[PDB]
Amino acid sequence: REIITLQLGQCGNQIGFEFWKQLCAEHGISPEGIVEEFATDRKDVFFYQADDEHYIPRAVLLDLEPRVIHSILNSPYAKLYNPENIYLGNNWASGFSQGEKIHEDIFDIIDREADGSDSLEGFVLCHSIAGGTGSGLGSYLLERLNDRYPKKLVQTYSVFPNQDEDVVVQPYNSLLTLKRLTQNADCVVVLDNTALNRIATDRLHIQNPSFSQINQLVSTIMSASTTTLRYPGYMNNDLIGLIASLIPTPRLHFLMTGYTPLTTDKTTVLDVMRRLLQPKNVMVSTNHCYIAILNIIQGEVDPTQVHKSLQRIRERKLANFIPWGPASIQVALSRKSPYLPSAHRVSGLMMANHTSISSLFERTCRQYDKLRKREAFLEQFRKEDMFKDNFDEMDTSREIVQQLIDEYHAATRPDYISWG
Amino acid sequence: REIITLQLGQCGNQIGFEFWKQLCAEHGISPEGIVEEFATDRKDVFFYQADDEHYIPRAVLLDLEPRVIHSILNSPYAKLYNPENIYLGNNWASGFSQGEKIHEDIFDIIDREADGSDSLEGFVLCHSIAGGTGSGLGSYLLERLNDRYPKKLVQTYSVFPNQDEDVVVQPYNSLLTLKRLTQNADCVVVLDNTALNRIATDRLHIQNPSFSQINQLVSTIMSASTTTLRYPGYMNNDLIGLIASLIPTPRLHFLMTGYTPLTTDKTTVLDVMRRLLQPKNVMVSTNHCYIAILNIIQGEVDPTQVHKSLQRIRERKLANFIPWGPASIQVALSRKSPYLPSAHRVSGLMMANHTSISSLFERTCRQYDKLRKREAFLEQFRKEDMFKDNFDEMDTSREIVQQLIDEYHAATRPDYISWG
Amino acid sequence: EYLQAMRNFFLDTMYDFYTSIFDQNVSFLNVQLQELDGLTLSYKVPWPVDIVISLECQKIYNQVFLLLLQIKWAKYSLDVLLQIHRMFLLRVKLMHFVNSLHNYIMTRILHSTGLEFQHQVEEAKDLDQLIKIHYRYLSTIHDRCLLREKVSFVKEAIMKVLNLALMFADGWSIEKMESDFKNCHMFLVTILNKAFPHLESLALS
Amino acid sequence: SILKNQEDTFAAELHRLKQQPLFSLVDFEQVVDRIRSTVAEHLWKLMVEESDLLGQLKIIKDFYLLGRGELFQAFIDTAQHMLKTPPTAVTEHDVNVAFQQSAHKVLLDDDNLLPLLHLTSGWAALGLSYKVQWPLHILFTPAVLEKYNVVFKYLLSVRRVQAELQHCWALQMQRKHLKSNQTDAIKWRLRNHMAFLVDNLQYYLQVDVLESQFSQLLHQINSTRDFESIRLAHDHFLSNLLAQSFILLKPVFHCLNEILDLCHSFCSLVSQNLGPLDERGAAQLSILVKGFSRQSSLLFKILS
C-alpha cells in the first residue's frame, strides 16, 4: 500500500535529506515539487500527490539539539515539503526520557499523517545505532508504534557504529537499542561503517568527509530497494511480499546488502552475480551459511543468459549456503532507470539472511561483557540512574542477546529442523 | 588439472616475481590483471579467473626476514595479486624450526587455496638449495605436503649452490635438503650457478648483477616448460603425462634442461637439435648415457624436415645414450608465441634424465665427507644441536645419498635390467 | 495499444483487486474494477479490433488468467502470517515451494514468451499474418501451460497442492500434513521424471 | 552474382552456335568452360569469406578429429558409466548432459550450442552430429560427416586407454614411494611404460598424419579459385586420412584393435590391484605378458 517514512537523529535526518534529494533528481520533478513536462511513474507511496502535482513526501521530521536540521530548514528543497511537524543528550536514557515526555503530541503528528493516508503498508525510520540523540529516543518510538499498531510493518535502515576503539557507554546504548530491535521490530537492514570505509577508500581517496559519500551510497541503496515500488513492477510491490521469504523466524530478521559497482563513475549476469557473491561487494563486513538470498537486477539484460547463469551457478557451487532446508536464492529484474545517464548499465542489489553477522554482534557482546565485568563505564550519569536504579535491564538485554546469538549458532546447523 | 604455485625464500620469491612479470608481459593483460581488448588463451592453471577477468595467480607468498619481499609488496604488479597469505636464520634447522611452529596457519593457507581450486594437478615451489632462510623450511613444508597429499604431484625448480669455495655448514644443509628431495618428491628439475655463469659471460659482459639475468633465463625456461599448458596443446596437458616418460625410478628423478639460443637478442630443426645436443647449451654443467630425453620446439617449423632430421640423427649417432632398454628421445611442438616480437623464430627446450649429474652430487659428497671427517664445520650452532643431539641424521642422509650415487652408477650399466 | 493493455494489466494492478477477495456479489467486482473459483469479466471491445481478434482467444486468456490468480492466492495466503515451534518449519518447507512455483510461471512463461511475442507482432506488415501470429501465440501458451490433454496427469497435482495453502492457513495436525506433502511431492516427481524439452527448467529441485 | 550480368554474353555464344550448320566439340567445350569458370568462381568467392570455409574446417577438425582435446578429456573425467552396456533409454540424454556440463567449467561458455552427441560398449556406440550452414554448404555432405564420425570413434579409443594407463600409474606416486618393494613379488616389471610407449609412438604417428594433411589442405584452397578443384582437394584429403591412419580394413587395423584391447585389459588388472597384494593376480598377469609377446611378434608381420 502506502509507506510512511520517519526520520530522527543527526545521521537519520542526513540520510533522509540525501534520499529525498536522490528521488528529486531521479524522477522528473522540480525542487519545489512541480512535475517537469519533459518526463510514467508512481510516486504515491513515499509522496502525497497534489493538484499542481506537488509530491510532498511522507517524511515526519523530529529534531533534538538542531544544528544540521537548521541547514535542512533553509534549502531549495524546503519548498518540496512543509508538513508542519518539526518539534524539539547523547545518552540512551536521555533520548528515551525526552521522547517519553512529548510522546502525545508526536503521536498526534503520527495520527495526523495516518489520516493523511487512505491505506498503509509500513513505517520506515531513518536512524543510526548509538547516534546519541537518536539512540534511546528511537527505541522509545519503536515501542510506541509496536504498542499502537500490530497491523503494519516496520523496516529499519541503520548502521553499526565502529569508531575503532571518550564515550564508553556506547556498547550499553547500542545493546539496549538492538534489544528493542530484535523484540519490537519485524525486519532489520543493518550496515557497517568499516565496510563502507573499505569501499570508499578503494573507490576514492577521501578520508575526512566520508559521511557525505556514505550518504550517497545509502541513497543509491534506498532507491534500489524501492525501485520495484517507484517504477511500476508486477511482483512484490508490497513490502511484506519482499520481506516474507527472507525471514522465517522472529529474532533472526537481520538483512545484509550488496551492490555490484564499488566505483560507479558488457557486464553480464554471470559477472554481476559472482561480484555480488563477494563480501567486498557487500557493505557489511565454523563455516557460515545463508538461510536465503534475494537479488534484484536493474539494467540492460538479455533474458536468455540468466537461465544459463543460474545453471552454472549451481554447477560451480560458488555460494555455500545450507540452513537445513530448501531455501535458495531469488533473482528478480527491475527497470533500468530513465531520466538519468545510464552508465554502468547493469547493476544488482542483494538481500540475504546470513548467520555471519552474529559474529559482529558477538564482538559488541565481547566488549559490553568486558565493561559489564568492570562496571565503571556507565559513568554514573543520572538519566540511566533514574530509568533503572538496579540496572537490571542491561542484564535482561544480555540474556536476550544470548538467546539471539544461540539462535544464530543453532541456525547454522542442519539440525534446525526443530526450533526454527 | 589446475596447478598451485608456491614461493618462499629470497631467490624463490625473486624468480616467482620474475615469472609472474614474464607471464604478465607475455599474455595480453594489465599489471592489475585486466584483460586487454587487443588480444585465445587458457590462463586457468596458474591464475584464478575473475569477473572482470582478473587472473589472480595461484601464488602463496611466505616470507622470513623480508627485505626484497617489501620491494615485491610495493609494485605496479601488486594489484595483480592479493590472496592475503603473507606471513612472517640462515640455517637448515633454523628454517625447519621456524616452519615447524607455524605449520598450522600456513596449512590453513594451503587448505584455503585448495578450496579455491575445484580440481588439482600439482604443486610447484620456488626454492633455492642452501639459500639460508629457504633451506630447511622448504624441506619441512615438503614433508608436510608429502604427509598430507599422496594424490598430487610436486615439481621443483631449484639451483645448485656453487660460490667457488665463511659459511661452511652449507654442504650439510644442502645434503639434508636433497635427502628430503630424493625421498619426499616425485620429480626434480635442478640447475647450476656455474653453467648460467658461463652462458651469461658468453652472451653478455656482466659479472655483478648476474642474479637479475639469471632470473630472466629462469622465467624463459619456466614459460617454455609451461607453454603446452598455457597455450592450448593437445598432448601432455597434464603434468604427469610429461613427467611419466622421463622417470622410471623413484630416486633417479632429477631432470636437466637446455635451451637453444644462448643470446636471444633460418635456424632449422637439424641446427637446433644439434645445438641442443651440446652441454654448453644445457644449463647444467666412464661414459655417461641418458635414460630418456624429451624435446619441445616452438617456432616457425616446416613439418617435413623433422622426419628427415631424426633419420639423420640416428645416422650420425650424435647422441650417446643406452641405459639398457628402449627409451629414446621424444620430440614435440608447441605454438610460437604471439603478443611479443617473434625474433629468433625457432627455439627448443630439452628435458632429460642423464647420469652425469651424479658426479656433481659426488663433488658435494666429496666436500661434505671431508668436512664430516674433520667435524668442525657445523660451528656448533644451537639449532642443529636441538634438532639432533647425536647428529645421526647427517649419517642417515650420507647413507641415502650413497644409495643414490650407487643407483646412478648402476643405472649407467646395460645390466640395469634388474634393480631399476 | 489495446492488446498491450490486455497482456499487461493481467497476464500489479490486479494484486489489489484479488486481495479483497481473500476477505461474493456480481456487482461489487464491477465497482472494484472501474476504480471453487471463477470470475465474471467483460470490458468494452471496439469493432475494428473486434474483427481482427477472435472471440475464442479471450476465453483462452481467461483460463490461464484464472490459474495465475490461484498462484497469487497461494503466494499471498501462506505469506501474511504473524512441538510448538514445529508449525513454523512447515511454513518454510512450503513457503519456498510456492515461490519456486511462482517464479517459474510468471517470469519463465508469462514474461519470456510475451517479450518474444511483442518482437513478433512488431514485424506484421499485413492484416492476415497478424491474425496468424497471435494464433501461434495461443497454441504455444496452450502447450507450455498444458490445458488440452494428459491434464489428469499434471494439473491435479497443481490443484491438490493448493489445498495446503488453505490447510496451513487454518491451522494456528502438523504430522498429517507432511505425510500428505511427501506423497504428492513424490507423485509429482514420479510423473515429471519422463522429461516438452522445457520441463526440466523447473525440475532443478 | 555476375552470372546475371554476363547472361546475354553466354546466350549470344549459344545462339551463335545455333546458326552454324557445323558442329565440333572443340568450340563447344570452350563455351561450357567459360561459363563454368564464372559459376565456380562465384561459389569460391562467397564460401571462403561469407560462409567462412577455413575456420569452419578448423572447427570440424577440433570436434571430429579431436583437434581440441581439452573438452573430450574433461568429458571422460565426467563420464564413466558407458564402460557398461547402455540402457539406450537414459544414456542418450546423459552423455549430452555430461558433455555440456564439462563445457560449462571453461571454454564455450558463450555460443555454439550446435554440437549434439548421438548414441545408437558405450564408447563403441557413441557418435556425434554437428550442424553447419546446410543451404550454404554442399561440400559438407552426410557421407563426409559419416567418415568423420568413424575417425572420431577411432580416436576416442586411443585417448581413453592412454588416460586410463597414466591414471593407473600410482605406483610411482604411492606404492614404490617411501617403500622398498620386493622385486618381482610386488612389482611386475612395471610394463605400464612398455604398454605406454607403443601407444605414445602411435599417437605421434597419428599426430604427423593429421598435421601434415591439414596444413596442405589449408593451402590448396587458397591457391585454387574455382569450386571444381576444391572438390578434388577435399576428396584427396579424406582418402589420405583414411588410408594413412590405417583405419582402413587391413590386417594391420585388426592387429591395432587387438593391441588396444590388451592395453585396456591390462589397465583393468592394476585398477583393481589397489594395494600391493597377490589375489591370484599372477595367473592373469602371466596371460597378459604372453599375449603381449605374441602381439609384439605380430608387429613384425606388418613390418615384413
PDB file of C-alpha atoms in Angstrom, chain B residues 197-207 213 262-263 265:
ATOM      1  CA  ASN B 197      77.516 -18.050 -15.313  1.00  0.00           C
ATOM      2  CA  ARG B 198      79.135 -19.447 -18.471  1.00  0.00           C
ATOM      3  CA  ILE B 199      76.144 -18.618 -20.681  1.00  0.00           C
ATOM      4  CA  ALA B 200      75.831 -15.138 -19.132  1.00  0.00           C
ATOM      5  CA  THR B 201      79.533 -14.361 -19.569  1.00  0.00           C
ATOM      6  CA  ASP B 202      79.306 -15.606 -23.147  1.00  0.00           C
ATOM      7  CA  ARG B 203      76.113 -13.791 -24.184  1.00  0.00           C
ATOM      8  CA  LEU B 204      76.971 -10.618 -22.259  1.00  0.00           C
ATOM      9  CA  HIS B 205      79.719  -8.922 -20.266  1.00  0.00           C
ATOM     10  CA  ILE B 206      78.038  -8.571 -16.866  1.00  0.00           C
ATOM     11  CA  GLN B 207      79.511 -10.050 -13.699  1.00  0.00           C
ATOM     12  CA  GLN B 213      69.781 -12.009 -15.819  1.00  0.00           C
ATOM     13  CA  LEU B 262      72.471 -18.512 -25.629  1.00  0.00           C
ATOM     14  CA  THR B 263      71.957 -14.965 -26.917  1.00  0.00           C
ATOM     15  CA  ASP B 265      68.811 -10.519 -28.829  1.00  0.00           C
TER      16      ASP B 265
END
